[PDB]
User: Fold GphF from Cystobacter violaceus.
Amino acid sequence: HRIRHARPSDLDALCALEARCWPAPLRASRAELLRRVTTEPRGCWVLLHEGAIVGATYAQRIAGPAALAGARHSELAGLHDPSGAALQLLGLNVDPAVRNHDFGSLLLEFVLAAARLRPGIENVVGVSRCGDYPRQRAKGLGYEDYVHGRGGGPRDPVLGFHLGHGARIGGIISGYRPEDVDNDGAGVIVIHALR
Ligand SMILES: CC(C)C(=O)SCCNC(=O)CCNC(=O)[C@H](O)C(C)(C)COP(=O)(O)OP(=O)(O)OC[C@H]1O[C@@H](n2cnc3c(N)ncnc32)[C@H](O)[C@@H]1OP(=O)(O)O
Assistant:
């Protein structure tokens, strides 16, 4: 296939993709999607399949993996540093109508490949979540134990997506996304080590 950088003209399709991949409380507004493409234009890609935007990634260069400490999903734009050693992912979605076709694995490996070619980038970081924690919440399993797989069962399908591509857990940010009630408002830091 072919993948290209994002453009402000794709805003209409990037919103329709956001509305399909996420429920209403967790969707990024039209202004936020435009802010990501304009702030870091070389750090946003769009996967095209049959001429449709079925996959999109958002990233901005931050100072490093340590700058994510105490971050918040709303106050996330202030971490932009054009001379930082880490590229923070801000979103990596694919359309539910085309999922499980090894498409999301292609976008993640492309961003990891682009960061190895951009100079100064040491790691690819980001605050992920857990899509199947409420099921383990009723079983008495704590959130921190569930992130590190200490619950006895398998990984979370969301965290296993990053862990399956060389990432490692780098901490938990409680109160990161209060509208993400499926994770008690918390987020999970993932770090893709490079070089
Ligand atoms: C920076 C922050 C915002 C982030 O990192 S975003 C957090 C990730 N997104 C979310 O949590 C919202 C929900 N979105 C999804 O679940 C999307 O399906 C996704 C996470 C983008 C995954 O993309 P997909 O369209 O499913 O395609 P792919 O990623 O290429 O792989 C397909 C599946 O094969 C799975 N797979 C592939 N190989 C394996 C192996 N060896 N073992 C187990 N599972 C595998 C892969 O984990 C995917 O699992 P599912 O989540 O159950 O679909």
DSSP finds six helices and seven strands in the chain. The longest strand covers residues 52-62.
